[model samples]
Target: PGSMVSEEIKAQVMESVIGCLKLNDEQKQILSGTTNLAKDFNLDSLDFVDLIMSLEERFSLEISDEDAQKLETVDDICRYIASKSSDA
Candidate 1:
């Protein structure tokens, strides 16, 4: 089979992010591209924790505290989950 994450994964992430934040269309559009989501979205530590919880619940993935900190970018988050998620 092909890889699991493609447009579908990105779309799922985008939906979660968009719902979690006060997103305008431009911000939403840029997030759809997905670079540094934490930085670009002005997310702080609490926000990250919330995001991680949401992600974990959504994907049934386990992320340690160290792993959460090491996930600096959106792609990193996606790749980590894509590779490590129980759903994988």
Candidate 2:
């Protein structure tokens, strides 16, 4: 991960995650660093795979299988996207 993730990147990452859910604005607002993708979003394995693909496309980056497994929360995805994009 990078030393820091900028506000712009954070916002973009948040948007991407929220977009994947296709939730309402109010639903989106409840999302936070501690938000659990599975429990809160009611996502299963198929949804997670979709999320990974969407993230990869949105961020224009590739995430390995190992790295994908490490993402369990909104914060994890945010940080990973920030770190990967910054490396570019």
Candidate 3:
């Protein structure tokens, strides 16, 4: 079965992302599970790495470069974090 992510983890992930980016009201309004980091928010590779670092600190987990590349959307990150958390 697919990993199950709770709303709490998802919310925390969202908050971390927002905090890392310092998103504006408009950007926050449109942010969702389907929002693409590179396509929608214009996050370059460096920006993505920075965001991943913030997330790793927030969640207290390590994400490899290969794993980081697979996370392109908010939902992807949330689910990945959830899976990692569950492993502990």
Candidate 4:
């Protein structure tokens, strides 16, 4: 039920998520695994909900509601997508 993805896919997923935030190119470029979902990105719970939608649409994957709730940071989202996409 778990897996890993290539660095390219990992980067794509991370950037896609960073793109969803209300951040500029400068902020997006500096994003990394340690960036906080809310604190650093100026995001709220509603923003995360939309983020889940974006990820699902872009990747053609189904993220369970429970699992969605657990993704609270950029790395968490990237890792989850990487794990899901690796199975395909």
lDDT of each: 0.70, 0.72, 0.77, 0.69
**Candidate that scores best on lDDT:** 3
With candidate 3 superimposed using the best TM-score fit, by how many Å does residue 46's alpha carbon deviate from the native? 2.9
For each of the candidates, the C-alpha root-mean-square deviation to the true structure, in angstroms, is 3.5, 3.4, 3.3, 4.1
**What is the per-residue lDDT of model 1 for residues 1-88, given as tens digits with 9 covering 90 to 100?**
2355544565566677677766887886665343677777777787777778888888777789898777867666777777764454
lDDT for model 4:
0.69
Candidate 2 differs from the real structure by a C-alpha RMSD in angstroms, to one decimal, of 3.4
Best by TM-score: 3
Candidate 3 per-residue lDDT over residues 1-88, each given as its tens digit: 2235646787777777787667899999887787886679887777777788877887888889899778888888888888777532
Global CA lDDT computed for model 2:
0.72
| Backbone clashes in model 2, listed as residue pairs | none
TM-score of 1: 0.76
Candidate 4 lDDT, tens digit per residue, 8-68? Answer: 5566666666666656778767766767766677687777777788778878878898987
Better of 1 and 3 by lDDT: 3
- Which regions of candidate 1 deviate over 4 angstroms? 1-6, 32-34, 85-88
Worst 10 residues of 1 by lDDT: 1-10
Hey, what RMSD does candidate 3 come out at?
3.3
- Taking all chains together, the TM-score of candidate 2 against the true structure is 0.74
